[PDB]
Every structure is written in C-alpha cells, then in structure tokens.
Amino acid sequence: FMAEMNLFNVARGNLYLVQTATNGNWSPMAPVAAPPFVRGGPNVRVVGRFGTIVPRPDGLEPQLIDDGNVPRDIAGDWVYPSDVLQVSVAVFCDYVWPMVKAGRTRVLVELGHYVYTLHYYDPQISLDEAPILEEWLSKINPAGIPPVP
C-alpha cells in the first residue's frame, strides 16, 4: 500500500499555494520543476503554534507570530502545519489568503498524507480556481478537513 497508495485516492507530501496564471499545460499532481522555498530555506518562516496575528496602528499592516514567538511581516514565504490551520482558518481566510491571491506571498501546507479529489475542466474557456479553494477553506475546523481538491 505504501507504494501504491495513489490507487486508493491517497496522496503523500505537502501542499503548495502559489498564484500561477498559466496559458499552456498544467499538471498539479505531477510537477516538473522543483518546489520552491523548501522548509528551512532562506527567508522561509514557519507559523507559531497558536497561529495568532497582531494588528498595528496608523497604516502599519498586521504581523504574524512565528514559532520563535516573534511578529513577522505577512508578505513572503510561510509554512503552515495543518493543526495550526485547523485552529486558525478564520484569521488565515481573513488576512493571509487575500495576500496569496495578490501573489505577494506563498504558503506551504505541511501534511504528511491526505485524501485528494479531482475536478476536470475545459482548457478552452476561462476559469478561476479561487472559489473552489475558498469553499475548501470554509469547511475546515478543529475536528477535520475535507479532501484536497
């Protein structure tokens, strides 16, 4: 099973979230280029164990608390352990996710294995993947998560 888990709709490895506007081919389940900002890479920050956020006054934009218990600037690269997401999806959906859609930040979701699901589309007509993800986020809670689309 550990060698053929894909046949049971189970995938391994982490999940990335980067705004990509492609015109040609796309293959999320079999990437060709090396993934960016592997954990421990330069300027890569891992969220704190509470996933809390702090506001700032008069123009200064909020900051996120890393594992070092230090507020950090949201823009850049970030790593989310799944559990932190499960307890802080709301603040993520309210502050981090918009920055992702702006392409000003990249997020790596750490989760060893997970159930995935697919959705096919016609490559000819226009499409935007954001609503599907936004729905998927809306159904995460401290208890469990829906399969990755």
Binding site: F50, T52, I53, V54, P55
Partner: protein
C-alpha cells in the same frame, strides 16, 4: 491648552472659588484612584499566564494621556482581605462550605 484630545484638553489648571480643605480631600481621592491604576497592556500577559499558556490572546487598546483602569491591588490588600474573611466567619465556621 495641553494634551488636547482633538477638541478638548486632558486636564486644566485653573483658579476659582475653592476652599483648601475640600481641595485637599479631593486631591487625595484622586491619588487613591491612581494608586489603583493598572496598565491595560499587561492584561494579555495576565491572561496568558493565568491560562498556564493554554490560551494566547490579543487585546488592542488606544493609549490616551488621561486613562484610568482602577483594577490593581497589592498583595498586602489581598492578604488583609483574607484575614478579614476569617474574622467575619469566626462566629459560624460552617458558613465557609459554599466555597
């Protein structure tokens, strides 16, 4: 005008019909209140510590010049308060059970 909160000053210094004795009382009462003042920013740490770090919290607050949060009490006050509890109970020790 000093420390103008946009339109209005935070405190003023004026001279008017006023007897010293009453003024002396009023000033001390202010001193008493300010002695009870607590810095609000420390609340979040108080919460986090009291929660044994099981909770992490944020409480934003604006910092104006004149701001009063009479919530602090020294250990002496509490210790005295505890002793007072024993005294008021002394006639009927059974009254402590509801605790």
């Amino acid at each position: 005008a000093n420390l103008i909160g946009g339109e209005v000053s935070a405190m003023v210094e004026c001279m008017e019909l006023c007897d010293a004795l009453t003024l002396h009382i009023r000033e001390t009462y202010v001193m008493l209140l300010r002695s009870m003042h607590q810095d609000p920013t420390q609340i979040v740490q108080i919460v986090n510590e009291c929660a044994n770090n099981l909770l992490n919290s944020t409480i934003p607050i604006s910092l104006r010049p004149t701001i009063l949060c009479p919530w602090f009490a020294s250990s002496e006050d509490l210790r005295l308060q505890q002793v007072m509890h024993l005294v008021n109970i002394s006639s009927n020790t059974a009254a402590a059970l509801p605790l």
